[PDB]
Structures are given as C-alpha cells and as structure tokens.
C-alpha cells in the first residue's frame, strides 16, 4: 500500500507509484493516514472502518 523506507527515504506500493510517477489515481483500500497525507491527496472517505 505505501510506506517510507526509513533508510533510503523511498516510498513503495500504490502511494509510491503516484508520488514517483506512473499513476494518476489510486481507487483502492488506501487508509487515510498522516504520513501518506503529506505526500498524496486523499478524497473524503468512501468507506469507514
């Protein structure tokens, strides 16, 4: 899904696929967290849990 690799400071997964390039939208179970919100742009929640 997405996490900052604390050694290399490089994202991965669906967050890292659109921060770093090759995606325009991420319609997927991407939980709204603070460390993701600083780099990507979430909608309002379509599902609560």
């Amino acid at each position: 899904y997405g996490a900052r690799d604390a050694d290399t400071k490089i994202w991965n997964g669906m967050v890292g696929e659109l921060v770093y390039g090759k995606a325009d939208i991420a319609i997927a179970p991407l939980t709204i967290t603070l460390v993701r919100e600083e780099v990507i742009d979430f909608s309002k929640p379509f599902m609560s849990l």
């Binding site: 997964g13 669906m14 659109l18 995606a23 939208i25 991420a26 997927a28």
Partner: peptide, 9 residues
Amino acid sequence: QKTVVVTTI
C-alpha cells in the same frame, strides 16, 4: 485526452 491510469491492489 489521455487514459487515466488507475492503480488498485
């Protein structure tokens, strides 16, 4: 216009 590239899992 271009095709928007969804990335699901």
